[PDB]
Amino acid sequence: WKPEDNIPREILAILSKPHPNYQLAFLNIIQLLKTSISDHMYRMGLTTMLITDKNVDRNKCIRIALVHDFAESLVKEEKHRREFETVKYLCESIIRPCSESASREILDDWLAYEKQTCLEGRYVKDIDKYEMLVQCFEYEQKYQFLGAINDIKTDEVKKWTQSLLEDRQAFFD
Amino acid sequence: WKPEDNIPREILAILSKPHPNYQLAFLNIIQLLKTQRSISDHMYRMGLTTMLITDKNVDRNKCIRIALVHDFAESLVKEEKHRREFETVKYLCESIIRPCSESASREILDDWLAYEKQTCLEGRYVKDIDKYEMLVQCFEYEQKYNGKKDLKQFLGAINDIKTDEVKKWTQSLLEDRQAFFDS
Numbered sequence A: 001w002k003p004e005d006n007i008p009r010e011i012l013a014i015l016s017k018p019h020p021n022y023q024l025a026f027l028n029i030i031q032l033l034k035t036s037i038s039d040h041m042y043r044m045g046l047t048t049m050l051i052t053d054k055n056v057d058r059n060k061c062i063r064i065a066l067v068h069d070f071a072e073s074l075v076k077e078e079k080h081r082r083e084f085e086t087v088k089y090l091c092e093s094i095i096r097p098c099s100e101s102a103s104r105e106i107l108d109d110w111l112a113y114e115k116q117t118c119l120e121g122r123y124v125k126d127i128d129k130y131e132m133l134v135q136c137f138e139y140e141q142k143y144q145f146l147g148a149i150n151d152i153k154t155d156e157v158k159k160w161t162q163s164l165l166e167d168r169q170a171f172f173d
Numbered sequence B: 001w002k003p004e005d006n007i008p009r010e011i012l013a014i015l016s017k018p019h020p021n022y023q024l025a026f027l028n029i030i031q032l033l034k035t036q037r038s039i040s041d042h043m044y045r046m047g048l049t050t051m052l053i054t055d056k057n058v059d060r061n062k063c064i065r066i067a068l069v070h071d072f073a074e075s076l077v078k079e080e081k082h083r084r085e086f087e088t089v090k091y092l093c094e095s096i097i098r099p100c101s102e103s104a105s106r107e108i109l110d111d112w113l114a115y116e117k118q119t120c121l122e123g124r125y126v127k128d129i130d131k132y133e134m135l136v137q138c139f140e141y142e143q144k145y146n147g148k149k150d151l152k153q154f155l156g157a158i159n160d161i162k163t164d165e166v167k168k169w170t171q172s173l174l175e176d177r178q179a180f181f182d183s
């Protein structure tokens, strides 16, 4: 495989020339965030700000909730590896040139989500799930949840889902 | 006028309710921000753009937050228009953010204030980037043609940028656009 087979032809052309415009190349690879996971990650980022837990840097939480689904855009056993190498490629062939801190921190936050070596990654995955719960509920509000209270880690988002389920039982009747 | 006018009823029902689900209501308010002048997508591309700041003297966390909130007063939208957005941010904070995270309320209010009215370096950077990506938009559009172009959005860009770093980005971009038109 090759982690450029999905990078468009002309962005590849932009980066290959010596000392390219890595910023426009980024704002182009991102101006592709609409296929719409851009809204998804943005909404999750805004949601992270509501964590009561004192043991939280919600800034890293936003970082995680802004970069994690942003990997599966290009790209399982082969996946969460080759996704790792495409994140590697974006970090070291786009971000590392014109940004020192960002390449490192971005990769390690992507891992912090894709291995959950941090409480923030756990919160962000909890949110990727609980927002979808909200969406299923607000959908059937015009007319499936699957044990998802078990499928939540943290106690805080567990309580969020508990409130959501109370509202479910209110609605149906 | 008052901000409650520009708010869907379903959410107000979620709110004048005993044990209101403030998180669900916040998620609803966020889920109807998908709309452009999408603005959720605009703020997301902003959020990932601001991470490309290398002015070591900048809190890019506050940058990402200002970016992700600076245009959030937009479900509730002629000097009084900014009055309405200010009262809107305040209404959303005192009545939706305070009742579930008292600190996030004063974080969001002051991040929005740091943007629209400038207060920090992070605000300057986020504003410069809202202009920069619009410039990228216009250039890609102009590229999909032989030119014209659509000068008028470019006349005088390097003067609407306040930071050195984004001035540099914009200089590179204007160079490449002149290269396009030299063909």
Ligand SMILES: [Zn+2]
Pocket: A040, A069, A128
């Ligand atoms: Zn997701």
Ligand SMILES: [Zn+2]
Pocket: B042, B043, B046, B070, B071, B130
């Ligand atoms: Zn903006």
